[PDB]
Ligand binder design. Structure first.
Ligand SMILES: Nc1ncnc2c1ncn2[C@@H]1O[C@H](COP(=O)(O)OP(=O)(O)O)[C@@H](O)[C@H]1O
Ligand SMILES: Nc1ncnc2c1ncn2[C@@H]1O[C@H](COP(=O)(O)OP(=O)(O)O)[C@@H](O)[C@H]1O
Ligand SMILES: Nc1ncnc2c1ncn2[C@@H]1O[C@H](COP(=O)(O)OP(=O)(O)O)[C@@H](O)[C@H]1O
Ligand SMILES: [Mg+2]
Ligand SMILES: [Mg+2]
Ligand SMILES: [Mg+2]
Lengths: 178, 167, 185, 363, 152, 7, 394, 414, 7
């Protein structure tokens, strides 16, 4: 049975490269519009993450699927750093300084999915994609730092740090297993 | 051994008079390339089947062809225990007939074992080493079967001692 | 045939490679570095544990710790770090697809090889492994099946006599005296 | 003089061009590999891939530079060199079994393909339609046609078969050449005629060859016998029964001496005495070479102590399957090339071979 | 599944009724005038007298290497085997070295035809005969034995 | 080690 | 090209392979598998350097199948997926293929016999409304095969990837009551080979692994000749084991399977098809014809289609037909069998006979105006223009 | 007189021994063998040669798991015997110690999965006919006997001979459609994903999260967690959310005993309650080669059978084997099958033009009183009839033809 | 197909 794809693609959704520039409900700066409905792509990705890591086949159907794939790949990086922390007030700083850290984008060495991701066509699109991915990273880390840390002992719950070894289709934004 | 020396010399000299194999595509079917001694489709590509025997009941039948040789061996079997052991041993040899590339999963009727050396086995593997393997089998099979017989005797003695010890 | 990683990983220096070559692909000192001063220059990227040659080059500001002492693993976290650096950085190969032939000195505590197997199966998920005695491999390398191997590594020395392949396990002499003791002296 | 191993798998057949600077071989698969002599080493320059089964006959026309290849897919191709690539033209053989051998005619106007369909296919060109057509010689043949060699007068054709017989057919095509001149084989030469048919009834015929002057036809049998039929002596047969393994190829280095090879892996030389009508074993051409031994390393000692608990004193380590004449023609040869089932290609020399052995006299 | 239609038309082997199959020719003079081979009475006379070499040569004087009759072939084979398996083990080399190349190429056929129906000690002497005949004639003799089309 | 020597 | 500069294209549109070119040509200009793929991620494959578009079609969609989920738009000659077929046709007439302006070209299409009429109607509708071709004709496949061979009589046994059909034709007059259609072909043989290989421990369960098994069946498999002798070879000897290297690197071994997968054409009951093999079906088709045409039908058995390229299929077909004839016509008289004259015409380029026949027919009828279905006739009548061909639809 | 035939159903995770004619297997032991194994060098065929009588120093069944100084080997993997030495020793103690049968007076009825290679049957025939000398053997497919085990729990007058049997054991899950008593073999499906894959998945889940589980029991725990707290979920992501937001109710505790110091360890059973069985409806969780749910495989099985026997096959889908004893397994299976069938029927009606509304296909999944040993009882029926002694391979047949007498089974033609 | 067989 197929994995969990995103259902946010709209015919009037704009594209960056070949990824749906989906609106996001956040406070950080970025080129994505602001969301009024109660669910953006990041909430959907955090909702589908725990199930999408067990599947081993993921058919890219539209561009919103590519955005959700990126966010699912980045939650696995957030978890690796949140596993080490021991206080939500430190998890937030770690997530901020990780979102700031520039990760490879489509069309550069180190990005795991150059084959199925259209690189930018010029410099302006490159800059817009960089800013968009940075905003996505920042808001995903911000939202996830409130899920990983449970208020009973204020340290990463073992129900979220057990997915550190689980890689989404064995791909990752970091090095090959490092 | 030294009682099989002329018999094995004759068998070896007849083996490298055959085993002069060549590539050949079939005549009775469009594009198949099959060993001509197994299908027996054309009677012009079949050499005379030569038998080399040491006595009445130990022999080698060699059937040559243009792209295949079938060597059937009828081994010495003195009594019933040696017959049972030879049957089981040849059967355990057939079981792995893809590790032995020149072996045959079923012996020719009347013979104990059978090798089928096509031309690919003489193009991709050493020919003299195949001859040496056949002759070494013929040298050592009797010795190995006798050691099996001695093992059966030892097992019988150990079982008897394990029973009569409890009384 | 299958390609099987051979990771000596004796004390002193880890030497890992592929089975079938004539020299280890990657040889680096088995040390783990830890910064012992404050970081003041933010934005340059920092790490909290340097491993191998990187820890050697930056030794001026690190506390080098050997995870193995006298042939025994004494700190398993740093040992896992060493193995991770060997697999994913030096050989750059996925460890969950190749067998692993590790080595251990004779007369070591059984808990050592037990935890070694547990780490290699539950952390890296290697499909198969094997823990061989160092001197036996040393005799393999010499191309003979009889002789007494006298292996003097960096943390342990030991002799193993073998005759026609039948190693005598009652005359294996071990001696905790090797390169590190000489360095301290 | 040298030995070069192109691959470890057998070589089905090979062919050289006019200036003996390029060779076309079969790597024991569908492809044809054309290597070129570059100094002292060989470098593959062309790959010809059109066949469905492995090629069994290649022949290179010197003057026109056209290759002909016949394989076990019942097809034949004529490759011409367009600019930098070889383009194939398909020939319709109309056979229903695998082809076995191909030979250009001396004048490069037609070529003969012997197949396992018990026929010979004489293929020629139709420039009225650009159509490679073929006629069939199929009367006295009862098995595969193994080897072919053309008479120097572009008409007669020697063919060995698996029916134990060597024959001399007449491949006269009355639409590409004129009526031929009378030869000591016969004056009546219509297409498909039978000029000569050996009396042997034992052993297949692996190789036939006409003399340099077209007055003698020699052949080798699986019966270990080498025979020569002379036409100036009422077609008299002189046979020699060898005591070694059979032969597979032969050639005429002079009008009196033959160079054969076979399942022995070394070339032997025979001679013909016309004043008596009998063959003589001239002797082995190759000098038995002493193959140097190598000390074993520890990795290889244990590798062959665990796994398995040169014997031959010639250049080739498997039977020799094809002998061609490199330079000098068949009237006075100086170099002959041998290819066998070990992927090797031995360029021999007649002068050096005659020098190394002083007990060796070439009639 | 299984087939519930008649598949008996696959058992008929039409290839044995083919018209383009290989048939082994034989000469018209060799088919009309059959050669009776050796004279057995002469052989028993030369054996009773006690001359082994001359009886050996009289066994190989003429052979049914041209006929197609099974009785004459079997009788000649029997006589030549009676001569071969009765030599002393010492005089075999001398008898072998007194034969031309065709003599050896025929002796090897008479040897390889004596293995197929052996007796208490026939093969133990035919093996020595084969040893000497191979020392003289080489593998070419065994190949001329294999690639023969009429057996003796 | 645990007893005798450090390791 | 005709006297109006309008290119006359010929397109075969097979279930397993598209063969397209121009009229009068001697060889198909482009032969590529007819499959449409979409990019997917897999946990066992890793590629990050070859640009993979959101929709790969045809040749590139087969060579790059390791990173795609592929599906055929056709099946059994019946178009199951119309959008994928429209993508395949866009690619066929696109720049990286036959490069034509479909507004000013004629096309020659084909179709198997005994096929639902809505299929042909929708194909013509698509060709006239989407690509807006200036002329379309839909010829019969056996007629094209007999055009390519150069005959006027014969029983075409056309066995493609998707479907096998036996169509006899006598002196140019089509007998449509003898057209038989058996639904076993390359694809069912491939599925049976997948089953047999699964019996050995290899699992080919993905969309891409089907092409791997297809390329295995094409290299190794062959049709037996004397199936008892082939079974004796497979059970007694070991000369039928052959190794094949999958694209990933694994080495599989194929043995008796080599002659068991393609045997499902002569013994359909192996794949749960209740009927007769291609040989028995051919014999029944012939023996259903009038007495005066059987003797000529036996002499012009024309093979066609890729699935008849198995090593030794003509000889096995001939042997089967001779055995059937001996048992069921001569009633067991072996003497008369030598008088029975079959001739199974298997040309060397029998894998593209339909395209060559289409090329010949188009080269003949390019310059006529009563042969092609013109776009104006479509705009005036609709799907009734097909009545020009002889197929009456309202 | 005659003695009852011996029935030995040898499965990957458990073997059922009995004498035909009874109602339940006399023994249900684990399919394991404890032999003495030490550190040796060399091949496996060479270090197995035991001197003297030391090859009889082994145990099987329950007595082989208790032995802490022996090495426990499992000869059967995925239903296919990968080791024949251990299998022969296992069979000889099954015959001479547990059954106490003299193997020359009893016909034997062994079992097999659908895709057992013919060489395995030939080796089994060689073992039973030449080593044990049985007068007759019969190697029946495993799931086809499981159909005749649902008749003891269903009302009179509705015990049908037609149904789709789903046998999910320790090593293999196969689907066999039987119609009117005739095994439709060319439609059988066979997937090597079964109970033991669930146990490996569950232990890998527990080992990535929990702490305190002794290594030497990390498998024995993942069985007690799988066969106790495991159920089936109607939706996966919704269940993950239900566990995340209200963990205090859905997360259970498992308390086991470390059988070296007899202390007690406690672990938390969380997601592996529903992720275990989910590899049935998502086989990619355990083996990335297969990607097809079990409902779709059953639908393909039934849609490949003849047309007029498709509607009864949907009505009597009989579960069997241990791995189908998961709460609400049949319910989710029937729900998915009903979805598929109703969608297909509505599509056919729409394509027809909208004039007829066909009978909705009744889909039923039958759980019965005998599932854990449903195969064996089936055998105990077949091996208790007279006609049984007419379908066995007599000793004469083997002595005449050889082991190739046992080479055919109803999965392949000719 | 629409009825009978898939296509
Ligand atoms: N060529 C050399 N000459 C002198 N001393 C050496 C040489 N090579 C290594 N050593 C010393 O021997 C010590 C231990 O040897 P080493 O090979 O590191 O042990 P191991 O094999 O266990 O790593 C090292 O600390 C090193 O300083
Ligand atoms: N040489 C071959 N041997 C056996 N099967 C083949 C061979 N070539 C192709 N096939 C099978 O037949 C199909 C190709 O036949 P083709 O006539 O092109 O089909 P289509 O009906 O699509 O035109 C392939 O899908 C393949 O499965
Ligand atoms: N009640 C249960 N719930 C879930 N799984 C079970 C249950 N009972 C047994 N199993 C699993 O099924 C397997 C044993 O069932 P069984 O039908 O005996 O298989 P086999 O016959 O192949 O050994 C074991 O892997 C076990 O974990
Ligand atoms: Mg050391
Ligand atoms: Mg077609
Ligand atoms: Mg079971």
């Amino acid at each position: 049975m197929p994995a969990y794809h995103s259902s946010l693609m709209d015919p009037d959704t704009k594209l960056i490269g070949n990824m749906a520039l989906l609106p996001i409900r956040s406070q950080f700066k970025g080129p994505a519009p602001r969301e009024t409905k109660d669910t953006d792509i990041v909430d959907e990705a955090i909702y589908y993450f725990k199930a999408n890591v067990f599947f081993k086949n993921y058919e890219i159907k539209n561009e919103a699927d590519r955005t959700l794939i990126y966010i699912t790949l980045y939650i696995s990086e957030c978890l690796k750093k949140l596993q080490k922390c021991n206080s939500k007030s430190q998890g937030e700083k770690e997530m901020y300084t990780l979102g700031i850290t520039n990760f490879p984008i489509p069309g550069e060495p180190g990005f795991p999915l150059n084959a199925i991701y259209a690189k930018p066509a010029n410099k302006q699109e490159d800059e817009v994609m960089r800013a968009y991915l940075q905003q996505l990273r920042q808001e995903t880390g911000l939202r996830l730092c409130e899920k990983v840390f449970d208020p009973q002992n204020d340290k990463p719950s073992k129900w979220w740090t057990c997915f550190v070894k689980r890689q989404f289709m064995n791909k990752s934004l970091s090095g090959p297993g490092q | 051994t030294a009682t099989l020396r002329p018999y094995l010399s004759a068998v070896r000299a007849t083996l490298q008079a055959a085993l002069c194999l060549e590539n050949f595509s079939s005549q009775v079917v469009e594009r198949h390339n099959k060993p001509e001694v197994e299908v027996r489709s054309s009677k012009e590509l079949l050499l005379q089947p030569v038998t080399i025997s040491r006595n009445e009941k130990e022999k080698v039948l060699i059937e040559g062809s243009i792209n295949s040789v079938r060597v059937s061996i009828a081994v010495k079997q003195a009594d019933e225990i040696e017959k049972i052991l030879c049957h089981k041993f040849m059967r355990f040899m057939m079981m792995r007939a893809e590790n032995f590339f020149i072996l045959r999963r079923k012996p020719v009727e009347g013979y104990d074992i059978s090798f089928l050396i096509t031309n690919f086995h003489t193009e991709q593997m050493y020919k003299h080493k195949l001859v040496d393997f056949v002759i070494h089998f013929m040298e050592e099979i009797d010795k190995e079967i006798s050691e099996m017989k001695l093992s059966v005797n030892a097992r019988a003695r150990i079982v008897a001692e394990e029973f009569l010890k409890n009384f | 045939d299958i390609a099987a990683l051979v990771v000596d990983n004796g004390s002193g220096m880890c030497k890992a490679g592929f089975a079938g070559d004539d020299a280890p692909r990657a040889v680096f000192p088995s040390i783990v570095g830890r910064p012992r001063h404050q970081g003041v220059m933010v934005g340059m990227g920092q790490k909290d544990s340097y491993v191998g040659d990187e820890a050697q080059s930056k030794r001026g500001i690190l506390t080098l710790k050997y995870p193995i002492e006298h042939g025994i693993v004494t700190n398993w976290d740093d040992m896992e770090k060493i193995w991770h650096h060997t697999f994913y950085n030096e050989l750059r190969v996925a460890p969950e697809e190749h067998p692993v032939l590790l080595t251990e000195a004779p007369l070591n505590p059984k808990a050592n090889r037990e935890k070694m197997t547990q780490i290699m199966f539950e952390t890296f998920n290697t499909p198969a492994m094997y823990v061989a005695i160092q001197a036996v491999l040393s005799l393999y390398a010499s191309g003979r099946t009889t002789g007494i191997v006298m292996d003097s590594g960096d943390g342990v020395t030991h002799t193993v006599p073998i005759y026609e392949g039948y190693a005598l396990p009652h005359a294996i002499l071990r001696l905790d005296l090797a390169g590190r003791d000489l360095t301290d002296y | 003089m040298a030995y070069h191993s192109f691959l470890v798998e057998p070589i089905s057949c090979h062919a050289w061009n006019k200036d003996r600077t390029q060779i076309a071989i079969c790597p024991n698969n569908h492809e044809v590999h054309i290597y070129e002599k570059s100094g002292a080493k060989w470098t593959k320059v062309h790959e010809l891939k059109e066949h469905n089964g492995q090629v069994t006959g290649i022949d290179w026309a010197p003057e026109s530079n056209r290759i002909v290849t016949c394989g076990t897919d019942r097809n034949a191709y004529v490759w011409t060199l367009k600019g930098r690539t070889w383009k194939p033209t398909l020939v319709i053989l109309r056979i229903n079994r695998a082809a076995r051998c191909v030979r250009w005619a001396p004048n490069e106007n037609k070529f003969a393909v012997g197949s396992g369909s018990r026929v010979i296919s004489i293929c020629y060109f139709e420039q009225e339609n650009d159509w490679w057509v073929c006629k069939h010689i199929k009367k006295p043949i009862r098995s595969t046609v193994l080897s072919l060699d053309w008479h120097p007068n572009n008409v007669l054709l020697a063919a060995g078969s698996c029916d134990f017989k060597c024959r001399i057919f007449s491949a006269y095509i009355k639409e590409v050449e004129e009526r031929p001149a009378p030869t000591p084989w016969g004056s009546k030469m219509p297409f498909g005629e039978l000029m000569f048919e050996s009396s042997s009834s034992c052993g297949w015929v692996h190789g036939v060859c006409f003399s340099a002057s077209g007055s003698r036809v020699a052949w080798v049998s699986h019966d270990s016998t080498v025979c020569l039929a002379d036409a100036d002596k009422k077609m008299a047969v002189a046979t020699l029964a060898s005591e070694t393994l059979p032969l597979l190829a032969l050639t005429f280095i002079t009008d009196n001496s033959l160079v054969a090879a076979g399942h022995d892996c070394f070339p032997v030389l025979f001679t013909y005495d016309a004043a008596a009508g009998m063959l003589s074993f001239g002797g082995r051409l190759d000098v038995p070479k002493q193959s140097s031994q190598r000390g074993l390393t520890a990795r290889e000692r244990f590798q062959n102590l665990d796994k398995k608990a040169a014997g031959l004193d010639s250049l080739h380590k498997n039977s020799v399957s094809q002998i061609s004449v490199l330079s000098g023609g068949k009237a006075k040869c100086s170099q002959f090339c041998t290819t066998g089932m070990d992927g090797g290609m031995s360029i021999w020399d007649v002068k050096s071979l005659e020098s190394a052995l002083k007990d060796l006299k070439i009639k | 599944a299984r087939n519930t239609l008649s598949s008996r038309f696959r058992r008929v082997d039409i290839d044995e009724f083919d018209e383009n199959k290989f048939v082994d020719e034989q000469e018209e003079a060799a088919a009309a005038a059959a050669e009776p081979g050796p004279d057995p009475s002469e052989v028993d006379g030369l054996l009773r007298q006690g001359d082994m070499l001359r009886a050996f040569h009289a066994a190989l004087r003429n052979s049914p290497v041209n006929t197609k009759n099974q009785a004459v072939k079997e009788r000649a084979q029997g006589v030549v085997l009676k001569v071969l398996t009765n030599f002393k083990s010492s005089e075999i080399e001398q008898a072998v070295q007194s034969l031309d190349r065709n003599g050896v190429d025929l002796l090897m056929k008479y040897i390889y035809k004596g293995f197929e129906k052996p007796t208490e000690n026939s093969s133990a002497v035919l093996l020595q005969w084969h040893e000497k005949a191979l020392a003289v004639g080489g593998l070419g003799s065994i190949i001329r034995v294999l690639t023969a089309r009429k057996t003796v | 080690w645990x007893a005798x020597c450090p390791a | 090209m005709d006297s109006q500069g309008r290119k006359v294209v010929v397109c075969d549109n097979g279930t397993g392979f598209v063969k397209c070119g121009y009229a009068g040509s001697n060889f198909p200009e482009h032969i590529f598998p007819a499959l449409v793929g979409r990019p997917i991620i897999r946990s066992t494959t890793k590629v990050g350097n070859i640009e993979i578009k959101d929709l790969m079609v045809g040749d590139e969609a087969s060579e790059l199948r390791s990173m795609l989920e592929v599906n055929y738009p056709m099946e059994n000659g019946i178009v199951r997926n119309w959008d994928d077929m429209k993508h395949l046709w866009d690619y066929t007439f696109g720049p990286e293929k036959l490069n034509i302006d479909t507004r000013n070209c004629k096309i020659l299409l084909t179709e198997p016999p005994m096929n639902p009429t809505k299929n042909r109607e929708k194909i013509v509708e698509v060709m006239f409304e989407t690509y807006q071709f200036s002329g379309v004709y839909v010829a019969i496949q056996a007629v094209l095969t007999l055009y390519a061979q150069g005959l006027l009589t014969g029983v075409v046994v056309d066995s493609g990837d998707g479907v096998t059909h036996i169509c006899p034709v006598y002196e140019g007059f089509s007998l449509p009551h003898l057209t038989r259609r058996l639904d076993i072909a390359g694809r069912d043989i491939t599925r049976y080979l997948i089953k047999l290989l699964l019996l050995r421990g290899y699992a080919f369960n993905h969309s891409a692994d089907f092409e791997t098994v297809r390329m295995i069946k094409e290299k190794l498999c062959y049709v037996g000749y004397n199936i008892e002798q082939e079974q004796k070879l497979a059970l007694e000897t070991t000369v039928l084991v052959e190794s094949y290297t999958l694209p990933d690197g694994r080495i599989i071994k194929v043995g008796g399977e080599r002659f068991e997968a393609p045997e499902a054409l002569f013994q359909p009951h192996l794949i749960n098809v209740e009927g007769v093999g291609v040989a028995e079906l051919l014999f029944n088709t012939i023996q259903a014809a009038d007495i005066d045409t059987r003797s000529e039908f036996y002499k012009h058995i024309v093979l066609s289609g890729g699935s008849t390229m198995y090593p030794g299929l003509p000889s096995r077909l001939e042997r089967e037909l001779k055995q059937l004839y001996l048992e069921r016509v001569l009633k067991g008289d072996v003497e008369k069998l030598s008088k029975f004259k079959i001739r199974i015409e298997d040309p060397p380029r029998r894998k593209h006979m339909v395209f060559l026949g289409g090329a010949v027919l188009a080269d003949i009828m390019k310059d006529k105006d009563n042969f092609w279905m013109t776009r104006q006739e479509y705009q005036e009548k609709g799907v009734r223009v097909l009545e020009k061909l002889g197929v009456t639809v309202r | 007189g005659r003695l009852p035939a011996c029935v030995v159903d040898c499965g990957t995770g458990y073997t059922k021994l009995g004498y035909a004619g009874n109602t339940e297997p006399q023994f249900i032991i684990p399919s394991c063998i404890a032999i003495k194994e030490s550190a040796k060098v060399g091949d496996q065929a060479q270090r197995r040669v035991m001197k003297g009588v030391d090859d009889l120093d082994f145990f099987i069944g329950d007595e082989a798991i208790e032995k802490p100084t022996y090495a426990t080997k499992w000869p059967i993997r995925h239903g296919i015997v990968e080791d024949w030495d251990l299998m022969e020793r296992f069979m000889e103690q099954v015959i001479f110690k547990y059954l106490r049968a003299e193997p020359e007076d009893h016909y034997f009825l062994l079992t097999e999965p659908p895709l057992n290679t013919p060489e395995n049957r030939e080796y089994t025939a060689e073992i039973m006919f030449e080593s044990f000398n049985v007068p007759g053997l019969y190697i029946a497919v495993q799931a086809v006997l499981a159909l005749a085990a649902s008749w003891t729990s269903r009302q009179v007058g509705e015990r049908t001979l037609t149904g789709t049997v789903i046998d999910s054991g320790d090593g293999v899950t196969h689907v066999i459609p039987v119609a009117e008593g005739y095994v439709i073999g060319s439609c059988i499906k066979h997937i090597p994903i079964a109970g033991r894959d669930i146990t490996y998945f569950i232990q890998q889940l527990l080992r990535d999260r929990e702490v305190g589980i002794p290594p030497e029991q990390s498998l024995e725990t993942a069985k007690a967690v799988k066969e106790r707290y495991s159920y089936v979920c109607p939706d996966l992501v919704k269940e993950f959310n239900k566990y995340d937001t209200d963990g205090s109710k859905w997360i259970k505790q498992y308390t086991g005993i470390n059988a070296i110091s007899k202390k007690e360890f406690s672990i938390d059973v969380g997601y592996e309650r529903f992720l275990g069985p989910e590899i049935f409806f998502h086989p990619e969780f355990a083996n990335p080669d297969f990607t097809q749910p079990i409902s779709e495989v059953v639908d393909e099985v039934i849609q490949n059978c003849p047309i007029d026997v498709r509607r009864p096959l949907y009505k009597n889908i009989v579960l069997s084997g241990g791995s189908t004893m998961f709460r609400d397994f049949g319910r989710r299976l029937q729900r998915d099958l009903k979805r598929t069938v109703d969608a297909r029927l509505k599509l056919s009606e729409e394509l027809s033009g909208g004039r007829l509304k066909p009978k909705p296909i009744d889909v039923q999944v039958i759980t019965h009183h005998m599932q854990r040993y449903a195969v064996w009882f089936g055998g105990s029926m077949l091996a208790s009839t007279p006609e049984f002694y007419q379908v066995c391979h007599t000793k004469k047949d083997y002595e005449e033809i050889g082991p190739s007498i046992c080479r055919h089974n109803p999965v392949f033609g000719v």
